[PDB]
Symmetry: C4
Subunit: 349 residues, 4 copies
Amino acid sequence: GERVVINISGLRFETQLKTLCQFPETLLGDPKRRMRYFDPLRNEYFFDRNRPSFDAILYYYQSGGRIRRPVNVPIDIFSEEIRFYQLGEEAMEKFREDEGFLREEERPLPRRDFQRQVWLLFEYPESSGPARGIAIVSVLVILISIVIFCLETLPEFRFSDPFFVVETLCIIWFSFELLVRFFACPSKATFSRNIMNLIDIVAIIPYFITLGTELASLAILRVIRLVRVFRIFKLSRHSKGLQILGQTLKASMRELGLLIFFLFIGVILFSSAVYFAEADDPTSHFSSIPDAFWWAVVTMTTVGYGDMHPVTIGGKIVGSLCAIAGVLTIALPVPVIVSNFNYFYHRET
Amino acid sequence: GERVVINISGLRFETQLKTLCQFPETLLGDPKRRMRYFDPLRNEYFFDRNRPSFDAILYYYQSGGRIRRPVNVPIDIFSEEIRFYQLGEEAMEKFREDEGFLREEERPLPRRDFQRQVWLLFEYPESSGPARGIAIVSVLVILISIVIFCLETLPEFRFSDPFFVVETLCIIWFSFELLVRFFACPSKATFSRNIMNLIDIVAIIPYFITLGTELASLAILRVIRLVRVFRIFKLSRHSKGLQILGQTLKASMRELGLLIFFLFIGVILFSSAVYFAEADDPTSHFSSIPDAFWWAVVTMTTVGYGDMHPVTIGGKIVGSLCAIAGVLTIALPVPVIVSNFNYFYHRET
Amino acid sequence: GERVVINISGLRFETQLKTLCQFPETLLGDPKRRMRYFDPLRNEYFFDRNRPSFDAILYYYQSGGRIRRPVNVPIDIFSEEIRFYQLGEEAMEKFREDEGFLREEERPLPRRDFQRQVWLLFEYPESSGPARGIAIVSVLVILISIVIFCLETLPEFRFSDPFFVVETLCIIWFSFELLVRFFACPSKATFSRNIMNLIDIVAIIPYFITLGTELASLAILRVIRLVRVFRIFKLSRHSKGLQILGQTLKASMRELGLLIFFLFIGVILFSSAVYFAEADDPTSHFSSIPDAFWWAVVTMTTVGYGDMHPVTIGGKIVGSLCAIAGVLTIALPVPVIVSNFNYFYHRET
Amino acid sequence: GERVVINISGLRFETQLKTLCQFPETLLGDPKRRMRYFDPLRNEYFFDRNRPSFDAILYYYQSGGRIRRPVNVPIDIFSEEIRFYQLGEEAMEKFREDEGFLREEERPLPRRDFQRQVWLLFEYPESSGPARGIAIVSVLVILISIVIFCLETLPEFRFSDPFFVVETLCIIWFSFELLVRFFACPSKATFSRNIMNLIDIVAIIPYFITLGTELASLAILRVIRLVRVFRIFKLSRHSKGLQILGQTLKASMRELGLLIFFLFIGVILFSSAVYFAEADDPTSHFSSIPDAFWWAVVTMTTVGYGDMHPVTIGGKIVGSLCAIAGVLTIALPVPVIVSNFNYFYHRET
Ligand SMILES: [K+]
Ligand SMILES: [K+]
Ligand SMILES: [K+]
Ligand SMILES: [K+]
């Protein structure tokens, strides 16, 4: 009913009393808090603050709580000017969600102290000196493990085996680390759904199941042997770029389906267009359409080994079209992935 | 003649009566609708609304209907503030056309009910459960058809033929689907000009004409056989990225002419510059200028099979220039295509 | 001395009389032109125009002539609002130079009429029907000429020669066209400095000098023969993308020097780093540092023919570094070239 | 206590006296300087200046010194309007640091004159004609030196050696130049920490140590011989793009660690996934996991020599995945490097 004139260094704003009456916990809400700024001479609440930012605040008061930072007032000034009018931590968290970078999560510390000290030791390498010692010994053990996996397959080589002893030491360290992390955890229920620990479990299961099978088929001699390579992803816990890549390959999971689907269409199109072109030629490298898949996938991605290439004046035309088509399809859903990685990289820094 | 002062929370706007008299169906147009906001004390129409957005509204009233959203007021607030002053659905559709994303099309439903129910069943997979069942069976039939086209050409293989029986089943399903879509259509005239149905017709004509020719030349044994591959594009009806790609390759049809023309110039330039360089050498792979086309098109697009490469200290210079020139020409009209795909992808989402 | 209050729909602007007295040919300059807008009631020049645009106009009046379009008011409104206050064609051309797209050039027409009619016939294909006929016959003659240059070098082939007769016809057409363009020109002095005509001269000189030499050395049998290929650039007069490419490769002539210099450094670095690595090996493909240039330039540009590749566990490391280095150097000065092409392409459209 | 109304051409700003009293050396600070603008009629300090820029100035006066250029007022106007109110060189340097391009460094000239003249002669080629003569002779000597390093290793060739005499002349010139730069320097302490002189020292040490060893092992016959190539980086002193590249490869040193780490993960993943796939095949090119590193690094970077490629229907699948994975990883940290180069290139121009 009563009009409140708010003189932001000359810029007058007029509002109804009810519009401020929405929030009785803000600076303009309580009559007593704002009464010091009242000037009897012109009956206007004199402020000397930033001008282009009070408009957003007033719209907040006039919209029930919505806050939109105008692009004119930079982030710092608008932060200072949302603090001054003391809209509250709720409004500030709302503005944080609107602008992005929602760093409102807090890592929960174990209930007791001893277990919490274990946690701060094994996790958060920067917490303590011994913590960073542990977190560097557990990256040297991983590098030793990778070297012993890659070096065990040499032709000169392939339980007195030194490589077996090194692998057993690596698994013992992995087990000890995982046991400390699971037992001394704040909650097993939250621990269970965590990729960085499912990886640590998957990188140790093959060794245990191998010992069980040997102590007591072709699947457990090739698939398990390959699964043993997942210890390369345990190098994500002690690294930062890898977590960014994992979050990128999780956010942009549809623009990888597009890349694979576009490749699958361009292979079935150009391989079938180059086989039917070489059909009469007796010198052709392509015996059938499913044979030219290996040519289309190394032409569209512009690798081009040269082991299989077209050999008629009609397969050369299709292989001129295939390179341009591969450039167009594999570079139409990659920039989306690169923009999502750029966002997931510059948010943290 | 009379000046109307409009106090947008202190920000006064003064306008002539004639300027509001243009539109007698808006909030400020009818005197009775706006009379509730009139304040006798200062003779100004008091509003408590968003300030930076009323300027665009006033310019609308002062320009005969033109609307331009100022970049200061975000889309949501400006939408709320074009609703409040009730400019009309016409102005709102105009603002939608100005900002982009013209989602004003409505799918026409068949006149009757039974035919409309058929339509909602075969089209719009999300409409009904059986609708999504049909729309997934018709993607499995397509995948079976592609597998039978790609697998019929194996050397071990090439009407008791199992592959013929599978292909006949696929064509019968395609025919049944197309017949349901054409008969139970809202309008055959609008149905005719639709790419996604011309594709469905082109992917079934070769089978019918083959049966006709066999039941009763070299063209119908190679060109038709190749045309049978167009069933890979029937996988666009049951997919979303493919429609985006088709619209991209339709919007940016000049920046593909540029890519093909730039390739055609760089081939005729560098192949003719590498043949004349290898002319005296007896070991050269290039016998003539039209022979070095197959080297220039696999060098400029940076595939490089190695089957044909230069062999003098003067063809090696031209093959050092060719790679850099191919990078420069094929990556000068591709970013336009990628920006048009980015627009056609982020409009829908 | 006297303050002029200018009420832009409530937004008052106050200025000195001297500030408007700078320009006695504008709307606010002449007292008689602006006197109709004077309102005796409040003594303020009432306007109902766009508000956010009059600030730029007032700054123009207060800065001696400088004009800067504020990013708030779109181009169309600001154009309308620079027309209304009738700042002049001079100010409008200044604003055109500030915003870009300086389309103020006008093609000069020949002094007389007959010669001007010839010009409108041979140039400006869209001017007349016969003009477009000529401009399409002169693109078919060019394509015939390219085909006869590329097809004369076939092994089966290489003055009763049909190819000679076709080439003579092409040169006769080129000569006739060039003669019409030079004679019936507005100015030979301006005609001389024009690339698109220097190209037309260079594509015809080799034929004349060949006839002179044959009618009456090794240089005139290879270099001139290669120079004959410049008729591919005569296809720029009858094309639009090619002119954009030529202007791109003229504007960004320093970011090609960077590409060539970066390649020249990475070749001299990695070829010298891979030769010294393979020195003891007897199976190496690299005999000397200037021999590994042909490997470094097909690795850094990621073509990779495979004709020359490293063969020790120390040349394989350098060839792992070479691919990543080539990606980093040849893709550090290419995006500048692509942005200059994007500007030179979207300016015209 | 007293309110100062500042009429920026109608736009009134009201401020406390204390807010201007912060800075007693600015235009509004001293009462005498601002008294000429005081108007007794309305008691407001009349200015006719740019309107959208005075808000930033007022916020400067109200924030203790902080300055943020609003994006509405272009750089030129805001520069003019920070000069007018004479905020000071300190504020102007602060605004320069805020906007970027901190060109506040000044090259220190030697204390005396003769030594300063030497400096202006050897450095700053544009200072003097003889200076540019020296700075071009020292780029021809470098090019001669590179040619003699690259040409000494030819098979036909490998102290009467002409190549030795040319190399000795080059080193003598390098020594003379370095001696002049170090002796006639403003400060040896600042001279020591400078990359462009450490390079000049490293490109001359190998020759001196070679003469010492020969005048009076395998390391000094290969590693030193390779180190002799660092004279290619002495071509950075007499070039501008190279300094930009060096600053790019210094600023973005983490997004190269990402490229190398992503390559190291994708090699250990796909090489181990293609070796285990080819294990039973007797025709495989991969004998062990550390052997397939040379395939993964020439597939992921899409070079693809063809010397080693997969040969089973299970290694071909992994080599279809490897090309797409290499495109995704090596093009996820390259655009950061390219944006840092774009910044370091367009700052100087
Ligand atoms: K390649
Ligand atoms: K290749
Ligand atoms: K190759
Ligand atoms: K490539």
